[PDB]
Amino acid sequence: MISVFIGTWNMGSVPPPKNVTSWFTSKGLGKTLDEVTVTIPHDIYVFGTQENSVGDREWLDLLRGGLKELTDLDYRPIAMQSLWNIKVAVLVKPEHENRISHVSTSSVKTGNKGAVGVSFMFNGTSFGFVNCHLTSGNEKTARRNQNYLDILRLLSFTHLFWFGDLNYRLDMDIQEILNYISRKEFEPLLRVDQLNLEREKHKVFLRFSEEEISFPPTYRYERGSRDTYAWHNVPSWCDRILWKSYPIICNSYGCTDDIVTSDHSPVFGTFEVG
């Protein structure tokens, strides 16, 4: 058993705040990490960002530096692939570099919007992580599905994790969306999330799992706070994490609410994998 943290954050083309620990520790809204397990530094940290204005060299240092402050360890980068403002990085608890083997990165571009990928071996178990940024727009669902198909075809596993700004929107007008959000009734909204719909229609992410979403749409917020959406773009769960395990436990899945540099909130996910 190992702990694989996964984070996806569309940073709205603006640098991050110097402290994003609530992202690392799965603190905020949704299925957050309990008061005890948060103190257990995870074995692998995967950081997927879109519209990331920071440079590859420095962004990795911000990540590796932030991890040391939290864990008191010097996590070891395994791979880091970037495609314009789309960047992904993988770090590992230093006491497990010998376990890693056959590290591989890849990329695919559609349009910037695309997908960066990383895969490696941990003991006799292989992993794959895909950080994407699909076509935006309320009425471009077929485009997003086709973007997913290209990535699934143009990329170069025992456990496969697909995350990023999938950009799927809600099929409901703003009046009812805000009404349901104010009551924290997300199920009526989730029933009309395009990603759920496209999965339930067996059109994309076939046999992919996603943890129950119990946090509010991560988009689109006004920069500076979380108590308000900038819907003039209906709120939507643009930023998602799905997995497909060979014939996995999800100890958390949510978003922060104290990181307010972007119009997206950071989304996190932690898993215990074999």
Residue numbers in the entry: 423 to 533, 540 to 584, 599 to 674, 684 to 698, 702 to 728
What did the published study say regarding this structure?
Src homology 2 domain-containing inositol phosphate phosphatase 2 (SHIP2) is one of the 10 human inositol phosphate 5-phosphatases. One of its physiological functions is dephosphorylation of phosphatidylinositol 3,4,5-trisphosphate, PtdIns(3,4,5)P3. It is therefore a therapeutic target for pathophysiologies dependent on PtdIns(3,4,5)P3 and PtdIns(3,4)P2. Therapeutic interventions are limited by the dearth of crystallographic data describing ligand/inhibitor binding.
Finally, using a structural biology approach, we solve the structure of a SHIP2 catalytic domain in complex with a bound dimeric ligand and potent inhibitor. The related compound, 5,5′-ethane-1,2-diylbis(oxy)bis(benzene-1,2,4-trisphosphate)20 (5) (hereafter named 1,2,4-dimer), is a bridged dimer of the surrogate ligand of IP3Rs, benzene 1,2,4-trisphosphate. The crystal structure of the 1,2,4-dimer-SHIP2cd complex comprises two monomers of SHIP2 and a single copy of the inhibitor in the asymmetric unit. The 1,2,4-dimer does not occupy the positions of the crystallographically resolved ligands or of the predicted bound states of docked ligands in catalytic domain or multidomain structures. Indeed, the 1,2,4-dimer ligand fails to directly contact the L4 loop. Remarkably, we observe that phosphate P4 of 1,2,4-dimer interacts with D613. This, we suggest, precludes interaction of this residue with R682 and adoption of the L4-out conformation that, in its transient motions, accompanies optimal catalysis. While the distal binding of 1,2,4-dimer does not significantly modify the L4 closed (L4-in) conformation from that seen in the complex with BiPh(2,3′,4,5′,6)P5 (1), the compound is a potent displacer of 2-FAM-InsP5 and a potent inhibitor of 5-phosphatase activity against Ins(1,3,4,5)P4. Thus, 1,2,4-dimer meets both the kinetic and structural criteria of an uncompetitive allosteric inhibitor of SHIP2. One intriguing possibility is that a previously unrecognized substrate or product is evident in the 1,2,4-dimer (5)-liganded structure.
